[PDB]
RNA sequence: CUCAACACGGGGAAACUCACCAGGUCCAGACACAAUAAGGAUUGACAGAUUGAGAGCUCUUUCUUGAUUUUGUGGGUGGUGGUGCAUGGCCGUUCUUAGUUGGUGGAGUGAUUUGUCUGCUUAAUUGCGAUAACGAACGAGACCUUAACCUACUAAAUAGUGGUGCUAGCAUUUGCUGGUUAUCCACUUCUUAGAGGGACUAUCGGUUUCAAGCCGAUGGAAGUUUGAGGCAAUAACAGGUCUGUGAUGCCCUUAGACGUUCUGGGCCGCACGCGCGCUACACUGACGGAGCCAGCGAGUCUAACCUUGGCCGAGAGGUCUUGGUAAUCUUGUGAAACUCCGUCGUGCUGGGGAUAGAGCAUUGUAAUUAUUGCUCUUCAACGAGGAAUUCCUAGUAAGCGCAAGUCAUCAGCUUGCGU
């Protein structure tokens, strides 16, 4: 062993850096002063109405779960 | 990462190891000793294995 | 119980050797010289053979209550079923273990 | 009274025989039937390592031995005197177990 | 270490509670026998404490031996507890 | 890499071991400083792409996480990475032998020498002796373990023996062979193991300077130091080992890693040369029935170890139970050579069983590059081995198997043990 060749394409590629978007916590705001749910809550008893279900394409996906909460709609 | 230590270690030289130095070569597991050949020879006197004949 | 005497008597030996190497490493600075176990019903006891018992027995019971916990945590003894004593040394001028540690630490102070 | 059995196991001859001697001496201090010490055959536990680390040199072998001596005494006694005689003769290196029946 | 905060709390309280940790040199050992957390967490949390002081470690026969020093017992109070509590075997 | 490398590294590697090869993750980069950062430092992920892969690897998507992380600068840590010609420890070897060294005195300018020796003796620098040496120390011996003897002591349903009850068969006449888990009693020859005894070359004879000894006979369990080991000097080797060690200096590397882990593969690949071995070349034999005899040992509680007995199966094996943490059960380990009766009949034949085909099982996550076992078939060389060369002196050589180590499975190896 003298050196390394790295015949694999030259990938020092790393993960997405927990992608830094702007401020995002927004239900919606009407005038004086009410707020209503968008990106609705989960059906989990252990998700006590505080989690947002992402809608990618015909999917509802929770992030409180490690992997999978699928209430599809 | 769910594949990190996933290979089974239930028999053979990969599972067992020395209790003094954690090696896999020259292990003595007679009477449940689990000490390598070289480690046992340095402390056979403390265990109570003397050399008579 | 429920262990054959062949495995029982051997396991007592390896337990002693593990204890002895522990105290050589731990009480190196107190002139340690040996141990002996007395396996009795109702709190098996351990005696430490070290010259400076005033150092091994720390301030107000520390430094041996710590070692009592360290042994019973590692060897899974019930609490209060092991106690550690320290009586000093019988004539430390004649123990080769104690005179080798004396020789060792004298070298580390840069003595010729 | 009750039928009892005391089993002694050690790796030291000198430290074991006097303990059994104290057992029988306390047995006819206040007299009761002995079924005295029946010595089982000694067990020699042999470990045969090679001699070395790495295998250079003449292929020399060692053998190490641990000797297990075992003795059992089958006594009968009143319930009171059982505990005291089982607790007085306690010596390092000798493992004593007492079977109730 | 990421080592989520509710697992520092289990580790640090138990070190305050007894003053000693032994913990079994084996990484990825899957739920250390005394504390409810992983054995990797126990070994790596107290490596962090040792480098800054606060605890002294001994290693023997694939086992660690952790002893809380006098500069660590005072620090571990405001981390977890109130004053006038004795961590180690100083309690008689 | 001669003895002092080559069934050696306890090295019988399918994964693991593992150090090597093609690839994929992870940090297990402590702490300190500085920056980003509660308008979020950061972490994790469904489905699809992608991937050997149900690795959120990475990407598409948009949820979760919250101050531990991230980035940079120094370090830290790890390494079966290098150097055994930088070292420790261990071991081998010089070296199956008898050798080595102070103190005081003597010799010599001195390095050194004598002591530590002409002779005889011993396994021995073991002794008798001689003596410018005297008195000593280590090694040898002494010592310890083990194998042989004890009708002696101490007693044993975890070892036996005899009688006694109950009972089986046969003879019958009172006998012989048995069974009976404690029926009871008694004992310790055999077995066990504590303490001891016992051999000292004893008695006699012969030899030598008449000493140390040696030889022969008798007695004795034992007469080679009773047999076998263990232990084991001074000085050394550039002997081996950094791949036993959280033994270790220096060098290298330290995030696309030489760390670690995961899937695959390799270490086993074959024109060929060498070392240790196994099976053979048959009639002192092969095959088939029948007899039937050991010793050393190992064995499972929060884990599946040694397995009896019944049943199934040609076998390998399966299944239902049982005993055993063991002088109790496996186990009387009913081992093999061996012995008796028969078949073969001098024919590479019924010697030999390499190579190969098909099936059935077992261990394992996994058996292909056959793990191994079994069944049928295939039937190779080999007709006693040139020059060379090894080991061995009595319960030894050689033949013969058995247990243990390694082990989940694999013994053609080793360590012991008996015949």
PDB file of C-alpha atoms in Angstrom, chain D:
ATOM      1  CA  UNK D   1     -32.999 -33.197  65.221  1.00  0.00           C
ATOM      2  CA  UNK D   2     -32.586 -33.204  61.440  1.00  0.00           C
ATOM      3  CA  UNK D   3     -30.445 -34.968  58.827  1.00  0.00           C
ATOM      4  CA  UNK D   4     -27.833 -32.542  57.479  1.00  0.00           C
ATOM      5  CA  UNK D   5     -24.843 -32.703  55.138  1.00  0.00           C
ATOM      6  CA  UNK D   6     -21.764 -30.469  55.047  1.00  0.00           C
ATOM      7  CA  UNK D   7     -19.646 -30.396  51.881  1.00  0.00           C
ATOM      8  CA  UNK D   8     -16.138 -28.913  51.849  1.00  0.00           C
ATOM      9  CA  UNK D   9     -14.167 -27.937  48.745  1.00  0.00           C
ATOM     10  CA  UNK D  10     -10.742 -26.329  48.570  1.00  0.00           C
ATOM     11  CA  UNK D  11      -7.434 -26.150  46.738  1.00  0.00           C
ATOM     12  CA  UNK D  12      -5.342 -26.327  49.937  1.00  0.00           C
ATOM     13  CA  UNK D  13      -4.792 -29.599  51.790  1.00  0.00           C
ATOM     14  CA  UNK D  14      -3.496 -28.107  55.046  1.00  0.00           C
ATOM     15  CA  UNK D  15      -6.281 -25.518  55.299  1.00  0.00           C
ATOM     16  CA  UNK D  16      -9.026 -28.077  54.645  1.00  0.00           C
ATOM     17  CA  UNK D  17      -8.123 -31.032  56.839  1.00  0.00           C
ATOM     18  CA  UNK D  18      -7.986 -28.967  60.017  1.00  0.00           C
ATOM     19  CA  UNK D  19     -11.388 -27.452  59.192  1.00  0.00           C
ATOM     20  CA  UNK D  20     -12.865 -30.941  58.869  1.00  0.00           C
ATOM     21  CA  UNK D  21     -11.026 -31.813  62.089  1.00  0.00           C
ATOM     22  CA  UNK D  22     -12.734 -28.900  63.844  1.00  0.00           C
ATOM     23  CA  UNK D  23     -16.055 -30.106  62.422  1.00  0.00           C
ATOM     24  CA  UNK D  24     -15.623 -33.588  63.864  1.00  0.00           C
ATOM     25  CA  UNK D  25     -14.146 -32.227  67.109  1.00  0.00           C
ATOM     26  CA  UNK D  26     -17.272 -30.139  67.606  1.00  0.00           C
ATOM     27  CA  UNK D  27     -19.244 -33.238  66.600  1.00  0.00           C
ATOM     28  CA  UNK D  28     -18.051 -35.344  69.528  1.00  0.00           C
ATOM     29  CA  UNK D  29     -17.723 -32.446  71.947  1.00  0.00           C
ATOM     30  CA  UNK D  30     -21.470 -32.987  72.289  1.00  0.00           C
ATOM     31  CA  UNK D  31     -21.882 -36.482  70.967  1.00  0.00           C
ATOM     32  CA  UNK D  32     -23.850 -37.386  67.836  1.00  0.00           C
ATOM     33  CA  UNK D  33     -23.375 -39.897  65.034  1.00  0.00           C
ATOM     34  CA  UNK D  34     -20.572 -38.954  62.689  1.00  0.00           C
ATOM     35  CA  UNK D  35     -20.599 -40.451  59.194  1.00  0.00           C
ATOM     36  CA  UNK D  36     -17.174 -38.866  59.113  1.00  0.00           C
ATOM     37  CA  UNK D  37     -15.125 -37.297  56.327  1.00  0.00           C
ATOM     38  CA  UNK D  38     -15.370 -39.249  53.086  1.00  0.00           C
ATOM     39  CA  UNK D  39     -12.650 -37.910  50.819  1.00  0.00           C
ATOM     40  CA  UNK D  40     -13.617 -37.812  47.160  1.00  0.00           C
ATOM     41  CA  UNK D  41     -10.916 -38.393  44.531  1.00  0.00           C
ATOM     42  CA  UNK D  42      -8.774 -35.332  43.946  1.00  0.00           C
ATOM     43  CA  UNK D  43      -9.388 -33.471  40.695  1.00  0.00           C
ATOM     44  CA  UNK D  44      -6.407 -32.269  38.689  1.00  0.00           C
ATOM     45  CA  UNK D  45      -7.355 -29.500  36.271  1.00  0.00           C
ATOM     46  CA  UNK D  46      -4.763 -29.355  33.513  1.00  0.00           C
ATOM     47  CA  UNK D  47      -4.122 -26.469  31.141  1.00  0.00           C
ATOM     48  CA  UNK D  48      -1.506 -27.181  28.484  1.00  0.00           C
ATOM     49  CA  UNK D  49      -0.432 -23.957  26.777  1.00  0.00           C
ATOM     50  CA  UNK D  50       2.546 -24.013  24.487  1.00  0.00           C
ATOM     51  CA  UNK D  51       5.343 -22.014  26.140  1.00  0.00           C
ATOM     52  CA  UNK D  52       5.483 -18.851  24.226  1.00  0.00           C
ATOM     53  CA  UNK D  53       4.073 -16.048  22.292  1.00  0.00           C
ATOM     54  CA  UNK D  54       4.891 -16.458  18.575  1.00  0.00           C
ATOM     55  CA  UNK D  55       5.963 -19.893  17.419  1.00  0.00           C
ATOM     56  CA  UNK D  56       9.730 -19.564  17.206  1.00  0.00           C
ATOM     57  CA  UNK D  57      11.924 -22.110  18.930  1.00  0.00           C
ATOM     58  CA  UNK D  58      11.705 -25.734  19.870  1.00  0.00           C
ATOM     59  CA  UNK D  59       8.077 -26.777  20.350  1.00  0.00           C
ATOM     60  CA  UNK D  60       8.207 -26.828  24.142  1.00  0.00           C
ATOM     61  CA  UNK D  61       5.051 -27.383  26.169  1.00  0.00           C
ATOM     62  CA  UNK D  62       3.981 -26.533  29.716  1.00  0.00           C
ATOM     63  CA  UNK D  63       1.223 -28.014  31.824  1.00  0.00           C
ATOM     64  CA  UNK D  64      -0.406 -26.182  34.719  1.00  0.00           C
ATOM     65  CA  UNK D  65      -2.433 -27.862  37.428  1.00  0.00           C
ATOM     66  CA  UNK D  66      -5.069 -26.824  39.916  1.00  0.00           C
ATOM     67  CA  UNK D  67      -5.956 -29.477  42.480  1.00  0.00           C
ATOM     68  CA  UNK D  68      -9.516 -29.619  43.823  1.00  0.00           C
ATOM     69  CA  UNK D  69      -9.960 -31.543  47.071  1.00  0.00           C
ATOM     70  CA  UNK D  70     -13.512 -32.297  48.139  1.00  0.00           C
ATOM     71  CA  UNK D  71     -14.867 -33.718  51.390  1.00  0.00           C
ATOM     72  CA  UNK D  72     -18.376 -34.231  52.699  1.00  0.00           C
ATOM     73  CA  UNK D  73     -19.514 -35.073  56.224  1.00  0.00           C
ATOM     74  CA  UNK D  74     -23.036 -36.359  56.832  1.00  0.00           C
ATOM     75  CA  UNK D  75     -24.155 -35.240  60.282  1.00  0.00           C
ATOM     76  CA  UNK D  76     -27.410 -35.098  62.218  1.00  0.00           C
ATOM     77  CA  UNK D  77     -27.952 -32.463  64.890  1.00  0.00           C
ATOM     78  CA  UNK D  78     -30.597 -30.408  66.674  1.00  0.00           C
ATOM     79  CA  UNK D  79     -31.545 -27.244  64.834  1.00  0.00           C
ATOM     80  CA  UNK D  80     -29.886 -24.925  67.367  1.00  0.00           C
ATOM     81  CA  UNK D  81     -26.308 -26.208  67.188  1.00  0.00           C
ATOM     82  CA  UNK D  82     -26.306 -26.284  63.384  1.00  0.00           C
ATOM     83  CA  UNK D  83     -25.849 -22.536  62.877  1.00  0.00           C
ATOM     84  CA  UNK D  84     -23.022 -22.086  65.379  1.00  0.00           C
ATOM     85  CA  UNK D  85     -20.910 -24.962  64.045  1.00  0.00           C
ATOM     86  CA  UNK D  86     -21.532 -23.837  60.474  1.00  0.00           C
ATOM     87  CA  UNK D  87     -20.409 -20.313  61.359  1.00  0.00           C
ATOM     88  CA  UNK D  88     -17.383 -20.890  63.624  1.00  0.00           C
ATOM     89  CA  UNK D  89     -15.270 -22.916  61.166  1.00  0.00           C
ATOM     90  CA  UNK D  90     -14.860 -20.350  58.397  1.00  0.00           C
ATOM     91  CA  UNK D  91     -11.389 -20.148  56.888  1.00  0.00           C
ATOM     92  CA  UNK D  92     -10.027 -18.516  53.708  1.00  0.00           C
ATOM     93  CA  UNK D  93      -9.590 -20.840  50.758  1.00  0.00           C
ATOM     94  CA  UNK D  94     -12.210 -23.358  51.928  1.00  0.00           C
ATOM     95  CA  UNK D  95     -15.713 -23.305  50.455  1.00  0.00           C
ATOM     96  CA  UNK D  96     -18.393 -24.780  52.717  1.00  0.00           C
ATOM     97  CA  UNK D  97     -21.943 -25.521  51.629  1.00  0.00           C
ATOM     98  CA  UNK D  98     -24.578 -27.088  53.875  1.00  0.00           C
ATOM     99  CA  UNK D  99     -27.460 -29.085  52.405  1.00  0.00           C
ATOM    100  CA  UNK D 100     -30.595 -28.929  54.544  1.00  0.00           C
ATOM    101  CA  UNK D 101     -31.851 -32.464  53.853  1.00  0.00           C
TER     102      UNK D 101
END
